[PDB]
Amino acid sequence: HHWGYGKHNGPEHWHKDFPIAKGERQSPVDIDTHTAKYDPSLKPLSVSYDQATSLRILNNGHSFQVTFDDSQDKAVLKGGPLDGTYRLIQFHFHWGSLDGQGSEHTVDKKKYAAELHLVHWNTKYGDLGKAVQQPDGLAVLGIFLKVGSAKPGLQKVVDVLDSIKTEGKSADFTNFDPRGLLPESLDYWTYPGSLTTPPLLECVTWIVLKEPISVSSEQVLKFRKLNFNGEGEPEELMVDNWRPAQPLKNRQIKASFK
Numbered sequence: 001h002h003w004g005y006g007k008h009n010g011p012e013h014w015h016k017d018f019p020i021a022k023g024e025r026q027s028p029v030d031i032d033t034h035t036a037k038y039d040p041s042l043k044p045l046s047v048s049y050d051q052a053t054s055l056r057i058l059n060n061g062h063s064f065q066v067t068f069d070d071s072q073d074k075a076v077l078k079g080g081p082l083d084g085t086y087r088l089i090q091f092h093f094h095w096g097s098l099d100g101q102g103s104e105h106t107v108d109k110k111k112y113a114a115e116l117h118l119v120h121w122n123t124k125y126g127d128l129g130k131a132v133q134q135p136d137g138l139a140v141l142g143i144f145l146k147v148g149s150a151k152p153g154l155q156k157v158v159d160v161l162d163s164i165k166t167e168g169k170s171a172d173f174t175n176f177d178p179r180g181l182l183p184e185s186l187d188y189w190t191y192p193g194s195l196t197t198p199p200l201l202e203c204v205t206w207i208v209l210k211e212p213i214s215v216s217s218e219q220v221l222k223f224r225k226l227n228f229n230g231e232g233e234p235e236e237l238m239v240d241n242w243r244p245a246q247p248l249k250n251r252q253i254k255a256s257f258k
């Protein structure tokens with residue numbers, strides 16, 4: 001990709017090829033707890049990942065991503081702020097050059113060590129391609145990572161990262177259960193926003209979980225061994241692959257909990 005996260009191709013440059021970068025509904029945002037008010041009309045989130053079928057894990061040059069078979073309603077997200085049903089297509093992470101930063105969303109300006117994004121598309125639009133053209137096309141479930149005890153459900157992921165060090169490497173990754181990446185509580189904040197990488201389309205209902213998952217320092221250090229560059233190219237270490245908080249502008253963030 002021509003775009004990246006460095007001085008010369010990072011988030012400050014993106015608007016030149018993707019003008020919507022300066023749009024009215026851009027993500028991520030800061031979640032200000034004084035103003036993210038409880039809404040009693042919000043429903044409990046429904047996560048049904050039991051039949052999730054993972055396929056591949058890859059380094060795409062901006063993150064590492066695990067893909068899923070989205071051909072039927074195997075793993076779906078519904079309820080919450082969502083009308084209808086959204087199929088899981090992939091998850092990936094954003095992380096920092098140190099434990100003190102790396103998340104895209106912030107909470108009262110505080111940055112977590114990383115952020116997991118589980119990406120889902122609205123089945124009423126037929127496929128991902130048409131879905132991304134609709135303001136309610138995607139639902140992304142965002143989960144913060146803090147450094148603490150190890151997350152057993154992340155171990156299968158951490159264990160193959162050394163085999164996909166550079167951009168374009170990938171590996172077989174079947175039978176991975178994404179339920180193992182979820183915290184205890186499904187309490188959430190929600191707001192209308194965008195994809196946080198190009199093309200930055202404003203097609204996302206964001207659902208950000210209040211409770212972070214804990215991963216061990218040992219686990220998150222493996223994230224930081226990845227490279228933005230392809231094999232044979234000059235080394236550019238994949239850290240700080242997060243877009244900074246964008247202005248909330250005229251939007252409202254709602255909380256599912258008090």
Ligand SMILES: CC(=O)/N=c1\sc(S(N)(=O)=O)nn1C
Nearest residue numbers: 117119140195196197198199
């Ligand atoms: C196909 C697809 O899921 N693209 C995505 S997911 C995403 S993110 N970082 O979850 O908001 N950004 N983009 C461009």
Ligand SMILES: [Zn+2]
Nearest residue numbers: 001060061062
């Ligand atoms: Zn890409």
Ligand SMILES: [Zn+2]
Nearest residue numbers: 092094117196
């Ligand atoms: Zn993301």
